[PDB]
Design a binder for these strands. Structure first.
Lengths: 923, 920
RNA sequence: AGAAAUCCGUCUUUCAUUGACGGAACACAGGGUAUUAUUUAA
RNA sequence: AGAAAUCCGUCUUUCAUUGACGGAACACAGGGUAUUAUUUAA
């Protein structure tokens, strides 16, 4: 029982001059000792034998390679700091064979036959072990004895058996009773570092041992993976297909400045074979199959294949092959990985040192609370090492309003109680009234406000008293004075199992990166689901939103797409001016206003406008002269910094993030154009900075904005989903991920964040594999039937344009290519419902720009005849439609209709996708 | 740990001619035996003795009166059908003292000293018992002995010890008794040859009637004795004379008078009305109005204002303690004088056949491809003329019973207890390929079959999991059958735990219900009354919605079309008012009053109520020949285009409209007949005079009753669905699980009926000032209350706002007014208008010097910049409540009078208050 | 074991032969506290 | 135990000294398918 979770806090210590020097000296002492154990432990682990690896490997599920474990511990790439006995990339195998008494394994030969860091060199750890045995004055076998004991007692970590924390110090030096070298080891360590202290030696050992063990295990896995890479590297029959794929770059399809390796995912992987199969249809519109496949790949899992290279493959499709080219792409991948990725080196690292029971308890705290301001300090009582050598405890203060608010502030409520004072845990601070009168520096106002609210709560007798029962708090401090504080708490008895009455939910991600949730209940009786093996019921549906108010107006940071067209006329007007005055880009036609009009003719919202205008500015900058670029430089600055720039406005929507990316592209295109970079002179970050420092300043700021925006978006999505769970007694959450030890940054972030957050509220998280969850029919798919449907959209017939017919034709010609078939049949249903079958053949003839194309007003007249007027609503099977025709009511607000003589629920498609993940068991 | 629930079905049996005679003969035989058993059991119970009552009453929790139990069983008022030994209304005390051997108690004497039904007479049960002992050929003590044995063995029901269900028949007849043979011969001679089931049913009917009436008479006699003690308590009857001299006085124009009970005066709180009246005379009824509002808000009946106006006339002289005691005296005297004692008559209950319905799994189905077999069969034992009992099949029809249970499911995996939306199953909707062609008088039922049939072809119909082995069926002389299905539900509790979810619900002044959903949490904000930590989940409004071509109407609160959308109806109404002219002071030719309606731009149902009142007023004075045409216009009002017989939601507005239309017809009848106080009219005269209009009276009352029933059911359904969607396990409402509104009583009793079906636990409490309590602050621990506010733009502050401010300000003394008083104070302090306070104290109804509304508007516009700003005004029945915490969904945070406040839906606050109540 | 039957009801200036839905049973003198759109703009 | 300190961040043509809010930590060739109102009426 007892689920446990950790919440942590971060700040920087603010000691005075004496204590600051004490802390820095203590931390430097701890580094110096840590590096010393690093070298000595490097020698010890160099001294291990195969038999030891046998005892440590008795219990493992997978039969382990002893020779490789011995190799990774006996030879390491290290920095100059921890290098004693150098060895060359030739002598490695020769000496290994000498040490093991057998032929060097093929996997070990790959480990040795590897690229190494520029600043890292090889080291013979066994020879280091022998020289350590002399420098200790003991016989080799005595220290081998002691090492045998330590590995047995799990005092040290061996191949797959991790150590028991820091027991080695108490076992060996604190006075597992038979040592040969104990006195020598203790004197060696004590002479080289500092006088015996259990805590200090423990921290030194921990840092050194952690670095060495993680890098050794990484090298073992790396050697096996590299051997498999090599075994596949010779697999190719002939690099003829590989040369033609690589020669893609030479041909006219690629105009890019710089070349890149062609990996399997660029081709779409396995489905490219399906693509050729769809290509067998004819070359009538290879493009439609390209687009459908790419769209499906981007929707489900992998990165969308780049279309250009696939058009070039379409050029050579008959000769080269499907299997042969795709294996050729695999060859490109494997060779580049084999050559590029170096072997992991063993270097000390920059982790901090942890003081145990370092924070004074909140009830035992000392507060200088004044009536007009509380005491916002949290004190640590650390042991520090003076120059003389004695250890004494000193008080060091730090500031953290979050830690103060959630835990550290003293609550004075007689009856009220809480674990953490934060809205996600159920507590809201009383808002500030118009009597507040905060007067402090601006650079503190936010923090001051928090204090005010807390103090107000204390004044009202409202501040709840924490019930965490904290007995000790650790604190982890680094050389920069940054402190990290973990609070570990108990949550509740563990569930894990899904009974009747239990509530679960699923969540899915849109193409526009907007999330949606679907909440279900396990019921005693009703509708049966074969995958789950129980009876399910639909509770509710909705979208994930994170809302803030600005003078009473609500903005959803996660999906706000900006001002509508008519509301940013002036900004548009300024853009118009710049586009008018300036004139076209490199075919030297189109003096810019035409494109601007095209952007404005769609009447877009503000952030889409900003993205498209950023694309237009990079295009404009592209050809222009060095003297011309000065003028444009000024306008770029107003675009990025004034009135509506991404540095001033932008929500957390996908639109805003791509706008920032496009603005970065503007600056990069500026730098390329001015520098005339090409294959002869590949401009670097350094050259951009030296050339133009301020615009590099802008580039840095933009990447910073971007990173913070992504982090904030992930945190907010997780928060919104957790609140929705908390209000609806949801006990289980399912998302697109796997919990073991191909992805989107948003999908990865949200999944790992919910993994972090759900155990705090005793909510159990599951991961699954979302394959075509956008199209599966809830309660029908895999129960037991395996049923799919297409996505629809609802549009008034007055606005059926040429693109509706283009989409209809494209969906109809795509029966063979994967997700296309559901769309093909969808069009069939459409034709069956509105009785337009006669047009089908003419729709087959609908090609890109034919004059003889059946026009849209024909369709409008037929649909108006069929529905009476031009304002009636029709449903059209289109990709990424917002309407899903569900067999059952599995979305909130879904309505019931009859389409093609079939009972149907008009549902939010995204809500259907969320339900489909909620009903998934296979990951 | 296994609670039970019952769902029942009602229908009518449709046997053929032969089986119809068999069934009617069986039922008539069963009545005849039941009536015989009634007379004989009346005699047997006439023979009980005090010692028997002791032996049955030893283990009573309370102290019981044996003499009264003996008396109520020894003398009964009966109908002529079961009357044997007539006894006169004088001789009872004498004969009772003869039979008991002691002085007849005054408590027992009151039961004898009573009014009785016109067609009911007293019965000497002792002499009937004596002669029954004769006719059996036995001695008195032998049957006293067997009666003792029967009473001891819980075979018969004596005062507090209910009988065993039907052990008597098997115990006394089924094969150290003394008389067994004589009694068996007696029953079998009079009734029919021994059958355990038939004799059991006969006995059950007779015995049940007798025991209910005996216990009821015991309670009635005790209550009457206390009423007599309190009626005779009052020394000087002068004050009551002053009340009815009120009746003679001018404050009354109604056709007929009535007894003046305590609740007409406001009860206890009337004393404070004096205390309020002592404050200041000049403006008397302001305090009166406050109390009426106060009384209507709580659980009480509104005192009629007219009587208090006269009471104020005589307040100084007639006194306060004397007036309320005198009103209690009138109440007690009329109750005592005109409530009869409960008589023992056989009754119309039906007879229950056990295991009478063929199981659904063993049923015979003549299923055709275009129509299923919608018959449910019974296999009943019936008595032929020869005397033998034989089983026959009789079919009946019930689409609800068929849909929920009886139809066979063909889904491999789906399952259900009942196929109804409240239990989680929705029938597949009909497609445009359905093609139903049947009689119109069946289309609804046909539609149900179609849906079920469609569900069957799709493999969708879930298989019931009720595990039914036997079903009873209760049949009466009219062929009406009732079928109870009893099902297993789950292990309840009264132990709210952590994670348990509860809710409360309250009812508005406009009969609009609201619900508040809370959770018991491990940590957070403590509630002293509950003894736990609570958290607020959500809040809402109870709605029951139906669609009409995609437009949603809430039956519970739809107030009808908006003004501009019903011009035509108004034109007709306007024309009729135009042509016609005023009513009795015979001024004000009707149109102007009509415009008084239209100037407020009301919605349709409010318009219909007010216009119905106006037709009533018109009808009042008019001549007999004139009424000729007014009748036809009344008819169009009630029957065409928008009359209540065609439109009307379930809102309080529509019900008041129906009440007003009935008032119209009653005023018609009075006006046409020129009935008066000494020349009264009866229903018989109304029917004979104008039969068709009495037919509309019938139809209107039927509509009223059906609408009320539907409203109660829909409110219960909506609340139960809301609970089911939110894992709510507890419900709390204003009731007690054993002074009321029919809606409050009905909703509480219906939720009591429905919640145990979903393993939901219902609690009742006492809603006192729940409209004003501050959630999580009231009784935590201090008792804090607040007034109700409303939000209005300053452009529309009128004279009535100033009136309400003045009235609330002068009402510090009278109960809830105190809170409203402070509200106005807070109001002024917030808007910095304290200077006006004194002038607001001078604001009387129609003064010329009144501070006008535009002063306030100019001042408030100054304070808030514009005339479109929103201000909060303390008004009675306001829709806004200023809560200490966020205890309503959609609540916003403001600062009022330098106090942080949540603007909450007031009704939602009341629901939260009901949810946090533990004392009833 | 006999093809008939609205089980009882509700809503809508919409009364619907595919409109949408709900139900254990018993037995006061004259009435305060709008929706689609879309038009020249802000 | 020393009166200072935005812990780190987000939103808004609103940048706020009472605006509203969120967070365990580690370590490619040129862009893809509106809201308040209230005005002559229905």
């Amino acid at each position: 029982s007892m689920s446990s979770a950790i919440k942590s806090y971060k700040s920087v210590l603010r000691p005075n001059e004496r204590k600051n020097q004490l802390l820095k000296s203590t931390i430097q002492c701890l580094e110096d000792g840590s590096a010393f154990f690093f070298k000595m432990l490097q020698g010890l682990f160099g001294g291990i034998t195969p038999e030891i690896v046998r005892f440590s490997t008795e219990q493992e599920k997978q039969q382990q390679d002893i020779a490789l474990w011995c190799a990774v511990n006996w030879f390491r790439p290290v920095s100059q700091d921890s290098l004693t006995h150098t060895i060359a990339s030739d002598n490695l195998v020769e000496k290994f064979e000498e040490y093991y008494g057998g032929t060097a394994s093929d996997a070990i030969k790959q480990y040795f036959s590897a690229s190494i860091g520029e600043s890292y060199y090889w080291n013979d750890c066994r020879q280091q072990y022998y020289d350590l045995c002399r420098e200790l004055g003991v016989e080799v076998s005595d220290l081998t004895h002691d090492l045998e004991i330590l590995c047995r007692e799990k005092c040290l970590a061996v191949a797959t058996e991790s150590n028991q924390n820091n027991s080695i110090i108490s076992v060996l030096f604190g006075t597992e009773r038979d040592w040969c070298c104990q006195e020598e080891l203790r004197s060696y360590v004590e002479q080289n570092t500092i006088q015996y202290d259990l805590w200090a030696w423990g921290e030194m050992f921990n840092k050194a041992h952690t670095a060495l063990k993680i890098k050794s295990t990484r090298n073992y896995n790396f050697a096996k993976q590299r051997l498999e890479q090599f075994k596949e590297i010779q697999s190719l029959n002939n690099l003829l297909v590989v040369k033609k794929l690589n020669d893609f770059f030479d041909s006219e399809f690629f105009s890019g400045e710089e070349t890149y390796t062609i990996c399997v995912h660029h081709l779409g992987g396995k489905d490219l074979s399906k693509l050729y199969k769809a290509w067998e249809d004819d070359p009538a519109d290879p493009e439609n199959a390209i687009v459908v496949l790419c769209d499906d790949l981007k929707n489900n899992f992998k990165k969308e294949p780049i279309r250009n290279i696939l058009r070039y493959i379409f050029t050579i499709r008959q000769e080269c092959s499907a299997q042969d080219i795709l294996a050729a792409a695999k060859y490109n991948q494997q060779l580049d990985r084999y050559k590029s990725q170096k072997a992991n080196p063993s270097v000390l690292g920059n982790q901090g040192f942890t003081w145990t029971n370092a924070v004074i308890l909140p009830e035992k705290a000392q507060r200088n609370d004044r009536p007009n301001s509380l005491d916002l300090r949290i004190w640590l009582y650390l042991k520090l090492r003076h120059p003389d050598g004695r250890w004494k405890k000193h008080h060091i203060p730090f500031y953290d309003t979050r830690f103060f608010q959630e835990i550290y502030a003293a609550g004075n409520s007689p009856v009220d109680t809480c674990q953490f004072r934060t809205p996600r845990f159920g507590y809201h601070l009383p808002k500030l009234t118009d009597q507040t009168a905060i007067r402090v520096n601006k650079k503190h106002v936010k923090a001051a406000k928090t204090e005010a609210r807390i103090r107000l709560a204390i004044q009202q007798g409202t501040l709840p008293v924490s019930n965490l029962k904290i007995t000790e708090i650790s604190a982890t401090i680094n050389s920069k004075g940054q402190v990290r504080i973990p609070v570990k708490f108990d949550v509740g008895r563990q569930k894990g199992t899904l009974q009747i009455g239990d509530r679960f939910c699923g969540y899915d991600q849109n193409q526009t990166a907007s999330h949606a949730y679907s909440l279900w209940e396990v019921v005693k009786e009703g509708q049966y689901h074969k995958e789950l093996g129980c009876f399910v019921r639909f509770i509710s549906s909705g979208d994930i939103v994170s809302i803030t108010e600005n003078r009473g107006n609500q903005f959803d940071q996660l999906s706000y797409e900006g001002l509508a067209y008519p509301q940013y006329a002036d900004w548009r007007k300024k853009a118009s001016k710049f586009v008018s005055l300036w004139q076209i880009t490199k075919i030297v036609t189109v003096e810019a206003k035409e494109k601007f009009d095209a952007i404005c003719k769609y009447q877009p919202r503000l952030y889409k406008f900003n993205k498209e205008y950023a694309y237009l500015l990079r295009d404009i900058v592209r050809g222009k002269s060095l003297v011309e670029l000065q003028q444009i430089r000024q306008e770029i600055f107003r675009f990025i910094e004034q009135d509506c720039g991404v540095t001033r406005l932008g929500s957390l929507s996908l639109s805003t993030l791509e706008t920032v990316k496009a603005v970065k592209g503007i600056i990069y295109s500026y730098f390329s154009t001015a520098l005339n970079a090409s294959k002869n002179n590949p401009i670097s970050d350094e050259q951009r900075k030296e050339f133009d420092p301020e615009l590099f300043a802008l580039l840095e700021k933009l990447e910073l904005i971007r990173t913070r925006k992504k982090k904030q978006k992930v945190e907010r999505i997780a928060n919104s989903l957790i609140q929705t769970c908390l209000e609806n007694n949801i006990k289980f959450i399912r998302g697109e991920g796997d919990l073991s030890t191909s992805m989107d940054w948003l999908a990865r972030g949200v999944f790992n964040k919910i993994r972090q957050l759900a155990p705090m509220h005793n909510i159990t998280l599951f991961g699954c594999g979302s394959l075509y969850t956008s199209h599966q029919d809830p309660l029908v798919h895999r129960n037991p039937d395996k049923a799919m449907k297409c996505r629809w959209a609802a549009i008034p017939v007055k606005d059926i344009g040429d693109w509706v017919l283009r989409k209809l034709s494209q969906n109809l010609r795509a029966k063979n290519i994967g997700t296309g078939e559901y769309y093909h049949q969808g069009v069939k249903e459409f034709l069956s419902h509105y009785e337009l079958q006669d047009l089908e053949e003419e729709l087959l003839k609908w090609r890109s720009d034919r004059k003889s194309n059946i026009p849209c007003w024909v369709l409008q007249n037929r649909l108006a005849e069929k529905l009476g007027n031009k304002e009636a609503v029709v449903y059209i099977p289109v990709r990424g439609g917002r309407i899903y025709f569900a067999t059952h009511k599995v979305a909130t607000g879904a309505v019931s209709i009859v389409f093609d003589q079939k009972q149907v629920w008009v549902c939010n498609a995204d809500h259907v996708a969320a339900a489909n993940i909620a009903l998934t068991v296979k990951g």
